[PDB]
RNA sequence: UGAGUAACGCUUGGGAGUGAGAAUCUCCCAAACCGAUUGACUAAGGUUUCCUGGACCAGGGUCGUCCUUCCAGGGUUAGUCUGGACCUAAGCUGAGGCUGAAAAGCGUAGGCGAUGGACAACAGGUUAAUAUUCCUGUACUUACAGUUAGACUGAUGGAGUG
RNA sequence: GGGUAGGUGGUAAGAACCUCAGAUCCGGAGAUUUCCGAAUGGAGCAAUCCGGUAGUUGGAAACAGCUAUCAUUAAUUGAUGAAUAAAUAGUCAAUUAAAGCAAUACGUGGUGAAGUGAAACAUCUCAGUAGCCACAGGAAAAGAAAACGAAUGUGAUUCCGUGUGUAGUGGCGAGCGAAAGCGGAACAGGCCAAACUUAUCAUUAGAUAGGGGUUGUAGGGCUUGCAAUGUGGACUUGAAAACGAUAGAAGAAGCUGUUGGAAAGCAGCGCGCAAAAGGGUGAUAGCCCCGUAUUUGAAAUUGUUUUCAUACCUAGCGAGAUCCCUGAGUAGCUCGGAAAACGUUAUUUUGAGUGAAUCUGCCCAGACCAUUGGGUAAGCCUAAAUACUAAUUAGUGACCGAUA
């Protein structure tokens, strides 16, 4: 509702693989104490078309620079896929 | 806890001196013994009190 | 200074703003994460005048999702494509659904 | 009130620039220090860099630009009297526009 | 440590011992305490003493003096030439807030020595802060701009009602004396001088 | 100093290539050991050690252009798999309550507690790194609403099974 | 509010902005304040999981958003209500408080050793120390004589010096060690119960709510008169004023030459001071800069004191009656312990037992009796001087200067 757990969309070389063939997969990064309703919900309030299906992915943090002076961690990420259904293609910039 | 329930006072904590005065912590403990009393519309309720109390609760009429 | 104007402004006109800016908002962290934000500023600004729009929306008793949950209006402009896909995908799958049900059916008899 | 602000005139009291005239770009308060366009002029010995749209040419020679100068090595130049010199200032508040000027202690000149 | 029940041990016995110690009837009393105590005299008759006894908290609360202060005056006159009956009355009017009092730039006495103490007043071979200070006879006592800076005024007029033993002109802040204040001056709220011979007995 | 001494902790030859530099890096051909295992899948643990590109300060008992080392980027997709939203064993906690100088100990009703019980998905393919999870094909299970037909519905409790 | 012309926290340059409708910055007052944690809806392997209830918005419902609430104990109140008629136990609901933490520090209380010394060791010492636990407070504790004590005596408690290493106490060994008095810091004494009386409780009151009383050269009550309308508090609300605290404003006085990379050093001639404390400025500056002395200033919050009024307390000296009240399982005594300097004993306290009297009364003055004298136990509260510094401001050091 608020519509703050939809933080950053990511684009890698598996989001631009999926994002092809018929049915897109987008791949985003939300709110990690957000539930895939709630990813849903914020899906329909700010985009329109009702995902089929939505996967979630938790990265856990790790040890990043290490042997630098101050070494320090990772931030949690939770990654959802969304798949809007057959023939539909909306931009994620531009509205 | 080995304590009257009408007053608060407990046991007293000494020391068993004996012949060559040799010091070995005691304890002295206060006489609980059952009592039953009538108060507020004269309701019997067992109550482990001092045999102090009990000879205080015989002369203060409560006791009957 | 920008606090006085807010401070003129009614409510439901600011619960309208703030609806606006977080939508703004979302567009520009959006427009960041894909490397298309040429004025990188606008989102502090943005960031700074919400929360003094929070403020002045906090100094009376009023809070600022619910009374937008009070009165609202609906969306528009996305539904043609999107009911054109969910008729495609449900006809499809009715189809499926009534072909495999005939296939059973038809074994069973046999 | 400043001693010195972004844009007056002033000199140099002490160094190898003495009576070295020139104009405050820019005050860091913090550091005590005071860029004067014309003197301390240095000369990085600048390297090449080639890491960005800018940094593809980054063309960078001898360029010499302002060393920052201590306050206090700083002095005020009068511009109102006819034999300009270098003196103190005041803080007079006058009751005109009640806004703090700036007034020379060896003359009656304003900032 | 339990379920202690005031309610059923009180109510248990209802006189008993510890009840009645106890007994939530217990008022407030708070006004009574302070107010009796406060302060008290009177004369017996076993001792004799009572009446000089009276006289001295008298004597002490027309200064606003602890009793430890009046034992170091009294010490400090005591030892000089003779009957000095007449120094100790000089000594325990030379106060410096006493004086402006006296002066008449205060409504009271105590106003006078906060005043003091706040730093209005300005002597002459010196300058005070502490309205404690034993002054000497002919000493003058200008005082400060900054208290006729706040006008309340009020006071100037009090000063020019004074009594024959102070000269001070009004408006003007300006104050001394001589002949030190008679008997007359000090009135019959305290005027004895048996209390006298007994801090020789309570003071060495 | 001992002392450039002991030691360097089970595995060969060659051809081509990279590179400033190669017994030690890449490819190929052999060769030798494992083969109820040095083979493959996982539990526990480890916690990015996984993939790509680059580097040879430091570490590798030599060397190194190379590494499980370092840098930058990326990688873990579940209604059906493993556990919660289901249940209990040993045991733990435990309102009341009992006991005890105090702190506390014991303990009822309740609640936790798998190493157990109940519960619906298989085959193939795909990326450098994920796959009963993604894709294709074919299925199954549990809820809610509407609808059609039939039927009186029958538990917090009793009994059987488990 | 102050205050300006710069600002976007450090390793930090650059890119991009803000800022003279007064930015950044400092001070006062507010807003927001995820989760765990006393954690308190339930659980749990902390920062996780699973919810109930009452609303409200979408849905056709399941459901999903957005709010508020949901722990336990204690007290009060109300409702309901067992064995068992009544009544309680119990159950439910509402309101009010409690939970925890820290200041490696001070207080009180409970519990409480040992190393060690005695050249061994058991009495003893260590030591009522360490430790454990409970409760606080800004201090705490103590406190107004049934006292000291030997006199034509002092007249709450607390703290300091002396009395003194004295009297004493100690396997009379190691050791321990006051109480008077004197000199000082501060000083303050109040209030209930009972008599007597009023009103009300099936008035069996022996209970509740008022008036009266708070003692020792005895006090108070009973009856009867005179004098009183005050003085003072450990005291409530207000109003006013003063002194501060939390940002700040103003704040004097120098040039020349020389060595030198650089002058402020050195030299010449000057100047200011209620400012010659200090810091910086390319060496060692009273007069280069920031400051310091001094004079000042607060919208807002807060501290101390004073004045005025205002609630609430507070009042003397007689006469007669000869009547009543003055704190009971209490003081004593016995059996085991302890506190005091005392290794148990006149005084204080208590685990077990017993147990008094009522101003011609009771306790005390180191066993005890008599005389004399002192004091009024078995009810409560009490500022100040006293103990300490995690923290805030200013400052100091014949304290340290990277093995300290
Ligand atoms: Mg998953
Ligand atoms: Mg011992
Ligand atoms: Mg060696
Ligand atoms: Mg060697
Ligand atoms: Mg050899
Ligand atoms: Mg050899
Ligand atoms: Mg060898
Ligand atoms: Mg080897
Ligand atoms: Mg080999
Ligand atoms: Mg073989
Ligand atoms: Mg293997
Ligand atoms: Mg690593
Ligand atoms: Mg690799
Ligand atoms: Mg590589
Ligand atoms: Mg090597
Ligand atoms: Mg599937
Ligand atoms: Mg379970
Ligand atoms: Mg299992
Ligand atoms: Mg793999
Ligand atoms: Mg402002
Ligand atoms: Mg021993
Ligand atoms: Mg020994
Ligand atoms: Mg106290
Ligand atoms: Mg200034
Ligand atoms: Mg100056
Ligand atoms: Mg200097
Ligand atoms: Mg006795
Ligand atoms: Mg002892
Ligand atoms: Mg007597
Ligand atoms: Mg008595
Ligand atoms: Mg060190
Ligand atoms: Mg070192």
Not at chain 2, 23 to 38: E, H
Request: charged share 30%; net charge positive; hydrophobic share 35%.
């Amino acid at each position: 509702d608020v519509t703050n757990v939809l933080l950053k969309p990511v684009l890698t070389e598996k989001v631009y693989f999926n994002q092809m063939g018929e049915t897109k997969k987008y791949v985003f990064v939300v709110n990690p104490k957000a539930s895939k309703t709630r990813v849903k919900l914020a899906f329909e309030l700010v985009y329109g078309i009702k995902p089929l299906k939505v996967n979630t992915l938790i990265r856990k943090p790790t040890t990043i620079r290490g042997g630098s002076r101050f070494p320090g961690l990772s931030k949690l990420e939770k990654l959802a896929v969304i798949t809007l259904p057959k023939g539909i293609a909306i931009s994620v910039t531009g509205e | 806890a080995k304590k009257d329930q009408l007053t608060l006072r407990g046991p007293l904590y000494g020391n068993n001196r004996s012949h060559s005065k040799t010091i070995t912590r005691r304890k002295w403990n206060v006489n609980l013994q059952p009592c039953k009393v009538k108060t507020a519309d004269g309701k019997t309720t067992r109550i482990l009190v001092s045999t102090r109390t009990l000879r205080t609760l015989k002369k203060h009429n409560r006791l009957s | 200074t920008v606090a006085k104007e807010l401070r003129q402004k009614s409510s439901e006109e600011l619960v309208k703003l703030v609806i606006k800016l977080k939508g703004e908002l979302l567009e520009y962290r959006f427009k960041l994460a894909h490397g298309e934000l040429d004025k990188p500023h606008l989102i502090n600004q943005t960031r700074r005048l919400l929360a003094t729009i929070l403020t002045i929306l906090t100094e009376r008793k009023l809070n600022w999702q619910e009374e937008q949950a009070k009165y609202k209006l609906l969306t528009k402009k996305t539904n043609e494509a999107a009911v054109n896909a969910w008729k495609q995908h449900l006809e499809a799958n009715k189809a499926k659904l009534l072909k495999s049900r005939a296939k059973r059916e038809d074994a069973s008899k046999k | 009130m400043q001693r010195i602000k972004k844009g007056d005139k002033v000199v140099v009291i002490t160094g190898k620039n003495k009576g070295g005239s020139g104009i405050v770009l820019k005050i860091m308060p913090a550091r005590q220090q005071a860029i004067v366009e014309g003197l301390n002029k240095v000369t990085r010995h600048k390297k090449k860099d080639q890491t960005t749209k800018r940094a593809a040419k980054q063309s960078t020679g001898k360029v010499q630009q302002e060393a920052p100068i201590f306050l206090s090595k700083l002095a005020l130049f009068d511009q109102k009297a006819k034999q300009q010199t270098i003196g103190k200032i005041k803080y007079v508040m006058d009751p005109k526009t009640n806004k703090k000027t700036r007034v020379f202690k060896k003359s009656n000149n304003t900032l | 440590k339990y379920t202690g029940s005031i309610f059923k041990r009180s109510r248990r016995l209802g006189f008993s011992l510890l009840e009645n110690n106890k007994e939530f009837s217990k008022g407030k009393k708070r006004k009574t305490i302070p107010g009796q105590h406060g302060n008290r005299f009177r004369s017996s008759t076993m001792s004799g003493y009572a009446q000089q006894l009276q006289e001295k908290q008298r004597m002490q609360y027309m200064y606003g003096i602890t009793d430890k202060q009046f034992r170091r005056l009294f010490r400090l006159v005591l030892k000089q030439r003779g009957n000095l009956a007449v120094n100790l009355f000089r000594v325990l009017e030379s106060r410096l807030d006493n004086i402006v009092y006296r002066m008449g730039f205060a409504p009271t006495r105590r106003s006078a020595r906060q005043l003091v103490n706040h730093g209005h007043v300005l002597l002459n071979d010196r300058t005070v802060d502490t309205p404690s200070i034993i002054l000497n006879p002919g000493d003058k006592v200008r005082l400060k701009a900054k208290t006729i800076k706040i006008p309340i005024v009020k006071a100037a007029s009090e000063s020019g009602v004074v009594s024959p033993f102070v000269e001070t002109n009004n408006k003007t802040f300006e104050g001394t004396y001589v002949r030190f204040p008679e008997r007359s001056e000090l009135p019959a709220g305290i005027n004895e001088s048996y209390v006298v011979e007994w801090y020789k007995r309570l003071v060495k």
